[PDB]
Design a protein around this ligand. Structure first.
Ligand SMILES: [K+]
Ligand SMILES: [Mg+2]
Ligand SMILES: [Mg+2]
Ligand SMILES: [Mg+2]
Ligand SMILES: [Mg+2]
Ligand SMILES: [Mg+2]
Ligand SMILES: [Mg+2]
Ligand SMILES: [Mg+2]
Ligand SMILES: [Mg+2]
Ligand SMILES: [Mg+2]
Ligand SMILES: [Mg+2]
Ligand SMILES: [Zn+2]
Lengths: 122, 207, 37, 175
RNA sequence: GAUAAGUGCUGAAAGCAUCUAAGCAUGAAGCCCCCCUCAAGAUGAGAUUUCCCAUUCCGCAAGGAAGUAAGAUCCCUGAAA
RNA sequence: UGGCACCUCGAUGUCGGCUCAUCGCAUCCUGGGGCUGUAGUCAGUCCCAAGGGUUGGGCUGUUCGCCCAUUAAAGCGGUACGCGAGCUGGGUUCAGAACGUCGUGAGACAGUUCGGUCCCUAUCCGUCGCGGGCGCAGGAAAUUUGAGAGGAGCUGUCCUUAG
RNA sequence: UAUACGUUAAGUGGAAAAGGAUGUGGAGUUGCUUAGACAACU
């Protein structure tokens, strides 16, 4: 459950280390984002010499959450952290490598580049 | 229009053929009996009166026994009517069984919601609290009763009072399974009322 | 449609009519449709 | 009224009857038409010569006079010759077909459009880009013809859509 | 289903024309329904099914009183309330 | 914004915010239309329409406004500039103190600044719930019709039609 | 639910202007008109 002021780890090499959630997209009063949802965020921590720089307003997709996601078959998946990937509008990641496992839910939302790049898609 | 009376037994879950896990409510409906057919000529409208759940003789009184004498059945604990039914397809004394429904059929389920007793505006009407800190002395109160001009409160200003225990219909539930041997209906999702409470399952009115 | 208090012929071909106790101007030119109001 | 004063010579094979309620029936080759008229209208039939008479010269009566004559004139010509309104389909791909007793129109929508003619009307479709409404009552032909044209009224840039036969569609310049 | 703005058909007054005067349509998240809930104190107190049955006193009657029928309550064990 | 001084000085508590709304339509979105200097996508303007909906933050006591990010939309007003015997008390106008300035001065603002007690057990009507009594031409047990009342009423994106 | 004679169709009566209008009633003037008008038809 990602909301405004939630800080996320970045699971790629775009240059951002930590982002702060500015806004959850996709409906007027929408309070919370979950895995697979796109958020607007600011880069709070950046890697020196990265493509993305501290203080930039970027779009990201949430790839891991502590709350996790329930599946139709009645199973659940949770992670120990909330992580996102900086993206463009076409849903390609702005980085080139994805770190850590990502949820199967990204395939449903057509984040296929991210899924292919992930070291594990659970 | 089809319908049947039953008791709410509880909830569980069932795996679908495609692997999905569907939560279901178990409704137990010992065969209902048609006690009376009302007609437009005699009564002014068409309806079938279903009796359910045979009551002990001791608990039944003489007026009840006479009413169910024509149907030739034990007195029933629960009597309800169904309107919109095919009158000619029913006869007094006919037993209505769960097998009128089939898996996948869409039904409406009526019941009385669980009572909650005296509840405040927050719980009863889902209103917002005031601040809990910053000097606030306004936490679970129901809000201004209205403007000054009318010199009175408008009707429908929501306030604390008894909550729950109202008749409530849930529409467009799916029948998951019909266990004719045990007279059970498995309906997807949940329905109003406490366990053992009377439930009415009708063919969906929006179908 | 022009909805104005002053409905008048704008050209010679405009015709003033009264439909439903309302003064109107119908004309071949669609810009000249007027209704009083 | 000039219009109301006119007298309608009934053709040979047309029969006009009335029930003294100003309910003139008119049988003829194409069919039968019934129409209740305003009580205070003297309708006379003297050997295939119809005339209407106004009792008093006054706004309401003057109007009803001319109308009653006009409507009678249509009833007689209707059952004898009958009326018809022609429609034209303009536009690439616009075409009309008759699936039994239902006009089917492919007028650039994502579905076909079906008009079912009401009792008394026939819709001939000589070509695919020409429709013909036929009937005894002049009102019903106009009504049905209007319904069909309403499906795709002529637009002003290219003229596409169902228009009436010989309708002066007011064209505009696009770019 | 009936309408609003709008679109009309037939049609005179006013040989033409005109959605209108008579007449006939179409047409909105809106109106009346459809859907959910309460509802006969609706004093206009409704309707249907079933049950009980014409007792004993007095008073000239009107009427009053006393036991009861069907049924219900007090009281008691409780909660799904 | 004013003009008047008719009610209130043996008291009709203030700006902003919070809780709760309600109404008008001069309609912000959604719905239906006329005209266009409307090709399409968009728009402009006018008509009908009040059913529902009409965001979260940074700065500031703020209303407002600017800005950040969204949304179909971020409507305009009335209700004692709705709502303090419902809350808050940051601003402003009690007593302290200080700066600038004015004054011979006590002090003052043509300006600022830090700190500063928000009382009341609901009688009546009203509002939300729950009972007792009687009535409804016999006494009861169930099931009901619906005069009438309330509720709900929102909308995005994508695929297809079809490049 | 008077009498007599007219007016209004707007529930005007029972709320407001400039302005607009083939609403309707009553007076008057004047152009043309069976050597044939207005309208519609070559
Ligand atoms: K000094
Ligand atoms: Mg406290
Ligand atoms: Mg009052
Ligand atoms: Mg004075
Ligand atoms: Mg006083
Ligand atoms: Mg006081
Ligand atoms: Mg308006
Ligand atoms: Mg105020
Ligand atoms: Mg108050
Ligand atoms: Mg303060
Ligand atoms: Mg009082
Ligand atoms: Zn014109």
């Amino acid at each position: 459950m990602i909301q405004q002021e939630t800080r996320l780890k970045v699971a790629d090499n775009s240059g951002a280390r930590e982002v702060l959630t500015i806004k959850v997209l996709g409906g007027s009063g929408r309070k919370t984002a979950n895995i697979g949802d796109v958020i607007v965020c600011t880069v709070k921590q950046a890697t020196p010499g990265g493509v993305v720089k501290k203080g930039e307003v970027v779009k990201a997709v949430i790839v891991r959450t502590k709350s996790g996601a329930r599946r139709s078959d009645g199973s659940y998946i949770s992670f120990d952290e909330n992580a996102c990937v900086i993206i463009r509008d076409d849903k390609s990641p702005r980085g080139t490598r994805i770190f850590g496992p990502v949820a199967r839910e990204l395939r449903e939302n057509n984040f296929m580049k991210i899924v292919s790049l992930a070291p594990e898609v659970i | 229009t089809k319908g049947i009376l039953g008791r709410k037994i509880g909830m569980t879950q069932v795996f679908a053929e495609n692997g999905d896990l569907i939560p279901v409510t178990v409704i137990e409906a010992a065969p209902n009996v048609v006690l009376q057919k009302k007609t437009a000529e005699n009564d002014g409208y068409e309806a079938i009166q279903l009796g359910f759940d045979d009551k002990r003789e001791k608990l039944s009184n003489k007026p009840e026994k006479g009413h169910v004498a024509k149907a030739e059945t034990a007195p029933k604990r629960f009597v309800k009517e169904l309107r919109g039914v095919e009158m000619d397809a029913y006869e007094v004394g006919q037993e209505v069984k769960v097998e009128i429904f089939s898996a996948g059929e869409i039904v409406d389920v009526t019941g009385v919601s669980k009572g909650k007793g005296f509840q405040g505006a927050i719980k009863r009407h889902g209103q917002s609290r005031g601040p809990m800190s910053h000097g606030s002395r306004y936490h679970r109160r129901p809000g201004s009763m209205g403007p000054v001009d009318p010199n009175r409160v408008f009707k429908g200003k929501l306030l604390p009072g008894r909550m729950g225990g109202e008749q409530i219909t849930v529409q467009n539930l799916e029948i998951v399974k019909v266990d004719a041997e045990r007279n059970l209906l498995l309906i997807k999702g949940n329905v109003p009322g406490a366990k053992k409470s009377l439930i009415t399952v009708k063919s969906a009115v929006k179908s | 449609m022009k909805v104005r208090p002053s409905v008048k012929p704008i050209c010679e071909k405009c015709k003033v009519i009264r439909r439903k106790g309302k003064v109107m101007v119908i004309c071949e030119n669609p810009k000249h449709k007027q209704k009083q109001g | 009224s000039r219009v109301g004063k006119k007298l309608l010579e009934i053709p040979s094979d047309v029969t006009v009857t009335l029930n003294d309620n100003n309910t003139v029936a008119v049988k003829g080759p194409k069919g039968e038409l019934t129409r209740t008229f305003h009580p205070d209208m003297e309708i006379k039939v003297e050997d295939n010569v119809l005339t209407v008479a106004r009792p008093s010269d006054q706004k309401e009566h003057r109007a009803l006079h001319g109308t009653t004559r006009s409507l009678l004139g249509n009833m007689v010509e209707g059952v004898s010759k009958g009326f018809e309104r022609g429609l034209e389909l303009v536009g690439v791909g616009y075409r009309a077909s008759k699936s039994g007793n239902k006009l089917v129109l492919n007028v650039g929508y994502s579905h076909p459009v079906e008009i079912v003619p009401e009792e008394g009307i026939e819709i001939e479709v000589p070509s695919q880009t020409k429709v013909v409404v036929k009937g005894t009552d002049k009102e019903r032909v106009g009504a049905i013809a209007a319904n069909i044209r309403a499906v795709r009224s002529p637009e002003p840039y290219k003229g596409k859509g169902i228009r009436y036969e010989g309708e002066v569609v007011r064209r505009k310049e696009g770019k």
